Amino acid sequence: STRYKTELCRPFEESGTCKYGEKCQFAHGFHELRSLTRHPKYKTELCRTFHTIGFCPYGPRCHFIHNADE
RNA sequence: UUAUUUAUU
Ligand SMILES: [Zn+2]
Ligand SMILES: [Zn+2]
């Protein structure tokens, strides 16, 4: 998968252990975080779901603008 | 509208 180790392994960051071990598809260290190939218009238009429901099921992985302030 | 994204041995 192109998403391999593109996101932190949350169970490893929370408890320091992971049942997937060296085969875990998520990052156990920031040294393993790779670069995501994203659409050239990534976050250039307002996310309809976040600007309508106040939330978005894609979370920080959404390809559209949620809040313009960090 | 670019209308999208892996919780996985
Ligand atoms: Zn893990
Ligand atoms: Zn969104």
Short mmCIF file of N, CA, C and O (backbone and C1' of nucleotides) and ligand atoms in Angstrom, two decimals:
data_model
loop_
_atom_site.label_atom_id
_atom_site.label_comp_id
_atom_site.label_asym_id
_atom_site.label_seq_id
_atom_site.Cartn_x
_atom_site.Cartn_y
_atom_site.Cartn_z
N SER A 1 0.86 -1.21 0.00
CA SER A 1 0.00 0.00 0.00
C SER A 1 0.88 1.25 0.00
O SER A 1 1.88 1.29 0.71
N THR A 2 0.53 2.31 -0.74
CA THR A 2 1.30 3.57 -0.72
C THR A 2 1.15 4.26 0.64
O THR A 2 1.96 5.12 1.00
N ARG A 3 0.14 3.90 1.47
CA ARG A 3 -0.05 4.53 2.79
C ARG A 3 0.88 3.86 3.83
O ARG A 3 0.77 4.16 5.02
N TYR A 4 1.79 2.96 3.44
CA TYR A 4 2.59 2.19 4.41
C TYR A 4 3.39 3.16 5.31
O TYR A 4 4.18 3.97 4.81
N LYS A 5 3.22 3.11 6.65
CA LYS A 5 3.99 3.97 7.60
C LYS A 5 3.86 5.46 7.20
O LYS A 5 4.75 6.25 7.50
N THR A 6 2.75 5.90 6.62
CA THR A 6 2.49 7.34 6.40
C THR A 6 1.75 7.93 7.61
O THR A 6 1.59 9.15 7.71
N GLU A 7 1.30 7.11 8.58
CA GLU A 7 0.59 7.61 9.77
C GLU A 7 1.18 6.97 11.04
O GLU A 7 1.68 5.83 10.99
N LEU A 8 1.17 7.65 12.20
CA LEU A 8 1.75 7.10 13.44
C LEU A 8 1.00 5.83 13.85
O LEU A 8 -0.24 5.80 13.82
N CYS A 9 1.68 4.81 14.38
CA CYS A 9 1.02 3.67 14.99
C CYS A 9 0.49 4.07 16.37
O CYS A 9 1.27 4.20 17.32
N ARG A 10 -0.80 4.41 16.51
CA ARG A 10 -1.32 5.02 17.76
C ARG A 10 -1.19 4.01 18.93
O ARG A 10 -0.77 4.41 20.02
N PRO A 11 -1.52 2.70 18.77
CA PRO A 11 -1.42 1.73 19.87
C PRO A 11 0.05 1.65 20.36
O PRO A 11 0.29 1.57 21.57
N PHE A 12 1.06 1.73 19.47
CA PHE A 12 2.47 1.72 19.89
C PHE A 12 2.81 3.04 20.61
O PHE A 12 3.49 3.03 21.63
N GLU A 13 2.35 4.20 20.13
CA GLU A 13 2.61 5.49 20.81
C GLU A 13 1.89 5.51 22.19
O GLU A 13 2.36 6.20 23.10
N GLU A 14 0.77 4.81 22.37
CA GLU A 14 0.01 4.87 23.64
C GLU A 14 0.60 3.87 24.66
O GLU A 14 0.70 4.20 25.85
N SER A 15 0.92 2.63 24.27
CA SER A 15 1.28 1.56 25.26
C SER A 15 2.73 1.09 25.02
O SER A 15 3.26 0.31 25.82
N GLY A 16 3.43 1.54 23.97
CA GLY A 16 4.85 1.18 23.75
C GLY A 16 4.95 -0.25 23.19
O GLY A 16 6.05 -0.81 23.13
N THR A 17 3.84 -0.90 22.79
CA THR A 17 3.89 -2.29 22.27
C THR A 17 2.97 -2.40 21.05
O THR A 17 1.98 -1.66 20.95
N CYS A 18 3.23 -3.32 20.11
CA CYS A 18 2.35 -3.52 18.95
C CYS A 18 2.35 -5.01 18.56
O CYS A 18 3.41 -5.60 18.35
N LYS A 19 1.18 -5.66 18.46
CA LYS A 19 1.11 -7.12 18.17
C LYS A 19 1.56 -7.39 16.73
O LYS A 19 1.82 -8.54 16.37
N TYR A 20 1.67 -6.38 15.86
CA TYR A 20 2.09 -6.59 14.46
C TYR A 20 3.64 -6.57 14.37
O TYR A 20 4.21 -7.12 13.43
N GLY A 21 4.35 -6.00 15.36
CA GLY A 21 5.82 -6.08 15.41
C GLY A 21 6.44 -5.45 14.15
O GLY A 21 5.99 -4.38 13.71
N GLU A 22 7.48 -6.04 13.55
CA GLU A 22 8.17 -5.45 12.38
C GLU A 22 7.25 -5.49 11.14
O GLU A 22 7.59 -4.92 10.10
N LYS A 23 6.08 -6.15 11.20
CA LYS A 23 5.17 -6.23 10.04
C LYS A 23 4.05 -5.18 10.17
O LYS A 23 3.16 -5.12 9.32
N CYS A 24 4.06 -4.32 11.20
CA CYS A 24 3.03 -3.29 11.37
C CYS A 24 3.07 -2.32 10.18
O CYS A 24 4.14 -1.84 9.81
N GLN A 25 1.94 -2.03 9.54
CA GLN A 25 1.91 -1.16 8.37
C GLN A 25 1.91 0.32 8.82
O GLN A 25 1.72 1.21 7.99
N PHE A 26 2.09 0.64 10.11
CA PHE A 26 2.03 2.04 10.60
C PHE A 26 3.38 2.42 11.25
O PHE A 26 4.20 1.54 11.53
N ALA A 27 3.69 3.71 11.43
CA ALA A 27 5.02 4.15 11.86
C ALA A 27 5.17 3.94 13.38
O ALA A 27 4.50 4.61 14.17
N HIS A 28 6.12 3.11 13.85
CA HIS A 28 6.44 3.03 15.28
C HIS A 28 7.40 4.18 15.66
O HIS A 28 7.40 4.63 16.81
N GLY A 29 8.19 4.72 14.73
CA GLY A 29 9.05 5.89 15.01
C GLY A 29 8.86 6.95 13.91
O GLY A 29 8.61 6.60 12.75
N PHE A 30 9.03 8.25 14.19
CA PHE A 30 8.94 9.30 13.15
C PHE A 30 10.06 9.11 12.12
O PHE A 30 9.94 9.57 10.98
N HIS A 31 11.15 8.40 12.45
CA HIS A 31 12.22 8.09 11.47
C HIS A 31 11.65 7.20 10.34
O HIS A 31 12.26 7.10 9.27
N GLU A 32 10.49 6.54 10.51
CA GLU A 32 9.94 5.63 9.49
C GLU A 32 8.86 6.36 8.67
O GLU A 32 8.38 5.83 7.67
N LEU A 33 8.41 7.57 9.08
CA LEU A 33 7.33 8.28 8.37
C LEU A 33 7.78 8.61 6.94
O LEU A 33 8.83 9.24 6.76
N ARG A 34 7.04 8.22 5.90
CA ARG A 34 7.45 8.48 4.50
C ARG A 34 6.73 9.73 3.97
O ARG A 34 6.09 10.46 4.74
N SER A 35 6.80 10.03 2.66
CA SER A 35 6.12 11.22 2.09
C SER A 35 4.88 10.77 1.29
O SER A 35 4.97 9.82 0.50
N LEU A 36 3.70 11.40 1.47
CA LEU A 36 2.48 10.97 0.77
C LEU A 36 2.40 11.66 -0.60
O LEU A 36 2.44 12.89 -0.68
N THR A 37 2.21 10.92 -1.70
CA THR A 37 1.94 11.53 -3.02
C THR A 37 0.49 12.03 -3.06
O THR A 37 -0.44 11.22 -3.12
N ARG A 38 0.23 13.34 -2.93
CA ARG A 38 -1.15 13.87 -2.77
C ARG A 38 -1.58 14.60 -4.04
O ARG A 38 -0.73 15.04 -4.82
N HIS A 39 -2.89 14.78 -4.29
CA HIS A 39 -3.37 15.51 -5.47
C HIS A 39 -2.80 16.96 -5.47
O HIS A 39 -2.64 17.55 -4.40
N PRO A 40 -2.49 17.57 -6.63
CA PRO A 40 -1.89 18.90 -6.68
C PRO A 40 -2.87 19.95 -6.08
O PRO A 40 -2.42 21.00 -5.59
N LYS A 41 -4.19 19.71 -6.05
CA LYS A 41 -5.16 20.66 -5.44
C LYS A 41 -5.41 20.27 -3.97
O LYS A 41 -6.42 20.68 -3.39
N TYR A 42 -4.53 19.50 -3.31
CA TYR A 42 -4.73 19.08 -1.90
C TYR A 42 -5.07 20.32 -1.02
O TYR A 42 -4.27 21.26 -0.93
N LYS A 43 -6.24 20.33 -0.35
CA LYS A 43 -6.66 21.45 0.53
C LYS A 43 -6.55 22.80 -0.21
O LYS A 43 -5.94 23.74 0.31
N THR A 44 -7.21 22.97 -1.35
CA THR A 44 -7.33 24.30 -2.01
C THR A 44 -8.80 24.75 -2.01
O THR A 44 -9.08 25.94 -2.16
N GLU A 45 -9.77 23.85 -1.78
CA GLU A 45 -11.20 24.23 -1.70
C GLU A 45 -11.77 23.82 -0.33
O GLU A 45 -11.24 22.91 0.32
N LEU A 46 -12.82 24.48 0.18
CA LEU A 46 -13.35 24.21 1.53
C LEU A 46 -13.98 22.81 1.57
O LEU A 46 -14.77 22.45 0.68
N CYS A 47 -13.73 22.00 2.60
CA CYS A 47 -14.38 20.69 2.76
C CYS A 47 -15.87 20.89 3.07
O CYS A 47 -16.22 21.47 4.10
N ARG A 48 -16.78 20.45 2.20
CA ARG A 48 -18.23 20.64 2.41
C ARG A 48 -18.65 20.00 3.73
O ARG A 48 -19.33 20.63 4.53
N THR A 49 -18.30 18.73 4.00
CA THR A 49 -18.74 18.04 5.23
C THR A 49 -18.26 18.82 6.47
O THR A 49 -19.05 19.09 7.36
N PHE A 50 -16.99 19.23 6.56
CA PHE A 50 -16.48 19.95 7.75
C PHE A 50 -17.15 21.34 7.85
O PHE A 50 -17.53 21.76 8.94
N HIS A 51 -17.35 22.06 6.75
CA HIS A 51 -17.99 23.40 6.80
C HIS A 51 -19.55 23.25 6.88
O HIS A 51 -20.25 24.25 7.02
N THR A 52 -20.11 22.03 6.89
CA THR A 52 -21.58 21.83 7.04
C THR A 52 -21.87 21.14 8.38
O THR A 52 -22.55 21.72 9.24
N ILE A 53 -21.41 19.90 8.61
CA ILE A 53 -21.71 19.17 9.87
C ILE A 53 -20.80 19.70 11.00
O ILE A 53 -21.04 19.40 12.17
N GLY A 54 -19.72 20.45 10.70
CA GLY A 54 -18.74 20.84 11.72
C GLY A 54 -17.73 19.69 11.94
O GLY A 54 -16.86 19.79 12.81
N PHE A 55 -17.82 18.58 11.19
CA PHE A 55 -16.92 17.43 11.37
C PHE A 55 -16.67 16.75 10.01
O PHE A 55 -17.41 17.01 9.05
N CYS A 56 -15.70 15.84 9.88
CA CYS A 56 -15.46 15.12 8.63
C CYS A 56 -14.97 13.69 8.94
O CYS A 56 -14.05 13.52 9.75
N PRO A 57 -15.56 12.63 8.34
CA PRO A 57 -15.21 11.25 8.68
C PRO A 57 -13.80 10.92 8.16
O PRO A 57 -13.21 9.92 8.58
N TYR A 58 -13.20 11.73 7.27
CA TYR A 58 -11.84 11.47 6.78
C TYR A 58 -10.80 12.06 7.77
O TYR A 58 -9.64 11.65 7.76
N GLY A 59 -11.20 12.96 8.68
CA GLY A 59 -10.28 13.47 9.72
C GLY A 59 -9.11 14.23 9.06
O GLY A 59 -9.30 14.91 8.04
N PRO A 60 -7.88 14.15 9.59
CA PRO A 60 -6.74 14.89 9.05
C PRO A 60 -6.33 14.31 7.67
O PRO A 60 -5.56 14.93 6.94
N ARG A 61 -6.84 13.12 7.27
CA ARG A 61 -6.50 12.53 5.96
C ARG A 61 -7.36 13.19 4.85
O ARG A 61 -7.20 12.85 3.68
N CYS A 62 -8.31 14.09 5.18
CA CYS A 62 -9.20 14.68 4.18
C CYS A 62 -8.38 15.51 3.17
O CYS A 62 -7.40 16.16 3.56
N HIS A 63 -8.73 15.51 1.89
CA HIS A 63 -7.96 16.23 0.87
C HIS A 63 -8.53 17.65 0.68
O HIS A 63 -8.16 18.33 -0.28
N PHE A 64 -9.45 18.13 1.54
CA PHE A 64 -10.06 19.47 1.36
C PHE A 64 -9.84 20.32 2.64
O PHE A 64 -9.52 19.78 3.70
N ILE A 65 -9.94 21.66 2.57
CA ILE A 65 -9.59 22.54 3.71
C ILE A 65 -10.61 22.36 4.84
O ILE A 65 -11.80 22.66 4.66
N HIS A 66 -10.19 21.97 6.05
CA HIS A 66 -11.08 21.97 7.22
C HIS A 66 -11.02 23.35 7.91
O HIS A 66 -11.72 24.28 7.49
N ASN A 67 -10.18 23.56 8.93
CA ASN A 67 -10.03 24.87 9.56
C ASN A 67 -8.83 25.62 8.94
O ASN A 67 -7.74 25.05 8.82
N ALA A 68 -8.98 26.89 8.52
CA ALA A 68 -7.88 27.65 7.91
C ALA A 68 -6.87 28.09 9.01
O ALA A 68 -5.78 28.57 8.69
N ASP A 69 -7.17 27.91 10.31
CA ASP A 69 -6.22 28.25 11.39
C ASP A 69 -5.66 26.95 12.01
O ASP A 69 -6.42 26.01 12.27
N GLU A 70 -4.36 26.86 12.29
CA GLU A 70 -3.77 25.65 12.90
C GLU A 70 -4.14 25.60 14.39
O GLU A 70 -4.21 24.51 14.98
"O5'" U B 1 -17.29 20.46 -10.59
"C5'" U B 1 -16.19 19.91 -9.88
"C4'" U B 1 -15.29 21.02 -9.30
"C3'" U B 1 -14.07 20.41 -8.61
"O3'" U B 1 -13.02 21.36 -8.63
"C1'" U B 1 -15.47 21.43 -6.99
P U B 2 -11.78 21.16 -9.61
"O5'" U B 2 -11.06 19.94 -8.84
"C5'" U B 2 -10.63 18.77 -9.50
"C4'" U B 2 -10.17 17.71 -8.49
"C3'" U B 2 -11.29 17.14 -7.62
"O3'" U B 2 -12.00 16.11 -8.30
"C1'" U B 2 -9.27 17.56 -6.36
P A B 3 -13.59 15.87 -8.13
"O5'" A B 3 -13.78 15.38 -6.60
"C5'" A B 3 -13.16 14.20 -6.11
"C4'" A B 3 -13.75 13.72 -4.78
"C3'" A B 3 -15.18 13.19 -4.91
"O3'" A B 3 -15.40 12.06 -4.05
"C1'" A B 3 -15.07 15.04 -3.41
P U B 4 -15.06 10.56 -4.54
"O5'" U B 4 -13.45 10.55 -4.45
"C5'" U B 4 -12.76 10.06 -3.31
"C4'" U B 4 -11.44 10.84 -3.12
"C3'" U B 4 -10.52 10.20 -2.07
"O3'" U B 4 -9.20 10.66 -2.29
"C1'" U B 4 -11.38 12.23 -1.25
P U B 5 -7.95 9.67 -2.49
"O5'" U B 5 -7.56 9.34 -0.95
"C5'" U B 5 -8.00 8.15 -0.32
"C4'" U B 5 -7.49 8.11 1.13
"C3'" U B 5 -7.45 6.69 1.68
"O3'" U B 5 -6.31 5.97 1.21
"C1'" U B 5 -8.42 8.16 3.26
P U B 6 -6.38 4.40 0.81
"O5'" U B 6 -5.74 3.65 2.08
"C5'" U B 6 -6.32 3.68 3.37
"C4'" U B 6 -5.65 2.65 4.28
"C3'" U B 6 -6.24 2.65 5.69
"O3'" U B 6 -7.52 2.04 5.72
"C1'" U B 6 -3.88 2.18 5.62
P A B 7 -8.42 2.01 7.06
"O5'" A B 7 -7.71 0.84 7.89
"C5'" A B 7 -8.22 0.44 9.15
"C4'" A B 7 -7.28 -0.58 9.81
"C3'" A B 7 -7.94 -1.16 11.08
"O3'" A B 7 -7.48 -2.47 11.39
"C1'" A B 7 -6.05 0.16 11.64
P U B 8 -8.08 -3.79 10.69
"O5'" U B 8 -6.75 -4.33 9.97
"C5'" U B 8 -6.47 -4.13 8.59
"C4'" U B 8 -4.95 -4.12 8.36
"C3'" U B 8 -4.26 -5.35 8.92
"O3'" U B 8 -4.48 -6.48 8.09
"C1'" U B 8 -3.02 -3.37 9.38
P U B 9 -4.16 -7.98 8.58
"O5'" U B 9 -2.56 -8.04 8.39
"C5'" U B 9 -1.90 -9.29 8.25
"C4'" U B 9 -0.40 -9.13 8.52
"C3'" U B 9 0.35 -10.46 8.36
"O3'" U B 9 1.70 -10.23 7.97
"C1'" U B 9 0.41 -9.76 10.60
ZN ZN C 1 2.31 -0.97 15.15
ZN ZN C 2 -13.03 16.82 5.22
#
